[PDB]
Design a protein around this ligand. Structure first.
Ligand SMILES: CCCCCCCC/C=C\CCCCCCCC(=O)OC[C@H](O)CO
Ligand SMILES: CCCCCCCC/C=C\CCCCCCCC(=O)OC[C@H](O)CO
Ligand SMILES: *C/C=C(C)/C=C/C=C(C)/C=C/C1=C(C)CCCC1(C)C
Ligand SMILES: CCCCCCCC/C=C\CCCCCCCC(=O)O
Ligand SMILES: CCCCCCCC/C=C\CCCCCCCC(=O)O
Ligand SMILES: CCCCCCCC/C=C\CCCCCCCC(=O)O
Ligand SMILES: CCCCCCCC/C=C\CCCCCCCC(=O)O
Ligand SMILES: CCCCCCCC/C=C\CCCCCCCC(=O)O
Ligand SMILES: CCCCCCCC/C=C\CCCCCCCC(=O)O
Ligand SMILES: [Cl-]
Length: 262
């Protein structure tokens, strides 16, 4: 009742498009899961956790997308020519709770392929996860108000954006100060990963703001479309680049299965 999805009836085309976006997302993540599983054998032990983290992200995201898809079809019924709310079973808040788990995984795999270790790894991961959790929690509280109090959504979103900026500064600083340690020419690749991250993660706050500038049923569809683009880019495409970097550095370090795979 606190999310704008509950305010509207949906045309068959809007309802089925959203359903198909979510089910397509389930398929893409679980297909990618198999890919990350199979190629982990070609990654040196030093980096293999990075590919395992992608597996964890795929199943985490895939399970939440599957849950959203079933909640969506549980919540609405086709009555008198439109899909109408029947039960209070759909909200975006499950995405937020999940980010508490997947964002730390996405950040950790980056730090691993940057060749951080020991105390710097643990210390950097700690500040990044705290910043990320601060971002997610303040965003979560904000979107509880996307119907009733847009001013409060904006203020919680400003606080959340401050955490996002500081998090990105930490990430960027570590990348640019450590890319000279990277093997196999991946010092070039990692810079592209950072820009991909900036682009993809910025789509989420744009989706967060849809209630402020497109509070109608098409805005609900747009938000799910943006989430879908952002999820695939920030998790799947990002994971593929992380895995490429891990295998390339593994090969340059003399791991034979990596050398043969490439
Ligand atoms: C605001 C508080 C953030 C300062 C702490 C911090 O960001 O530490 C990052 C450092 O680069 C990691 O070792
Ligand atoms: C809520 C309103 C707040 C508005 C706030 C607007 C400020 C945005 C400016 C920068 C964002 C930081 C993004 C991080 C970009 C990477 C920075 C970096 O990596 O620094 C390079 C390093 O210094 C070399 O070694
Ligand atoms: C796979 C999911 C990912 C990478 C989620 C990332 C989410 C964010 C970067 C969220 C950022 C937000 C803000 C910067 C302010 C508005 C509230 C958020 C939480 C949507
Ligand atoms: C192996 C790689 C492919 C993974 C297989 C994924 C198969 C289908 C996922 C299940 C999607 C069904 C959800 C429908 C829920 C609903 O809309 O009511
Ligand atoms: C079909 C499902 C996945 C097939 C993966 C099995 C292939 C084994 C690869 C091991 C190898 O390359 O030597
Ligand atoms: C309050 C929340 C704080 C959470 C801190 C999280 C701590 C994570 C620290 C580092 C995880 C590294 C584990 C995997 C080791 C990879 C190194 C390797 O195998 O080459
Ligand atoms: C229970 C798992 C959550 C772990 C939280 C630990 C990380 C703390 C990070 C920053 C906390 C930001 C506090 C914002 C809460 C205020 C919202 C409210 O209480 O209404
Ligand atoms: C955590 C960091 C600071 C949170 C500040 C934002 C609190 C806004 C509350 C608005 C209100 O409840 O009236
Ligand atoms: C990210 C979100 C940043 C929030 C930006 C706030 C901008 C101006 C607030 C306008 C207040 C209008 C009240 C309705
Ligand atoms: Cl997620």
């Amino acid at each position: 009742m606190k999310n704008i999805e509950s305010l509207f009836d949906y045309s068959a085309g809007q309802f089925e498009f959203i359903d198909h976006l979510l089910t397509m997302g389930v398929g893409v993540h679980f297909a990618a899961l198999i890919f990350f599983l199979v190629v982990s054998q070609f990654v040196a032990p030093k980096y293999r956790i990075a590919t395992a983290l992608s597996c964890i992200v795929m199943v985490s995201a895939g399970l939440i997308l599957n849950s959203q898809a079933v909640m969506w079809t549980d919540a609405y019924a086709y009555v008198d020519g439109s899909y109408q709310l029947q039960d209070l079973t759909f909200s975006n808040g499950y995405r937020y709770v999940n980010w508490m788990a997947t964002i730390p995984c996405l950040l950790l795999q980056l730090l691993i392929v940057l060749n951080l270790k020991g105390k710097e790894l643990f210390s950097t991961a700690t500040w990044l996860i705290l910043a990320a959790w601060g971002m997610i929690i303040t965003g979560y509280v904000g979107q509880l108000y996307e119907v009733d109090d847009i001013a409060q959504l904006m203020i919680w979103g400003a606080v959340s954006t401050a955490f996002f900026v500081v998090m990105n500064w930490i990430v960027g600083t570590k990348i640019f100060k450590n890319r000279a340690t990277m093997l196999g020419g991946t010092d070039s690749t990692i810079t592209k990963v950072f820009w991909l991250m900036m682009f993809a993660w910025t789509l989420y706050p744009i989706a967060y703001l849809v209630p402020a500038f497109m509070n109608n049923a098409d805005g609900v569809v747009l938000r799910q479309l943006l989430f879908t683009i952002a999820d695939i880019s920030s998790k799947v495409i990002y994971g593929l680049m992380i895995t490429y970097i891990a295998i390339q550095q593994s090969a340059a370090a003399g791991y034979v299965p990596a050398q043969q795979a490439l």
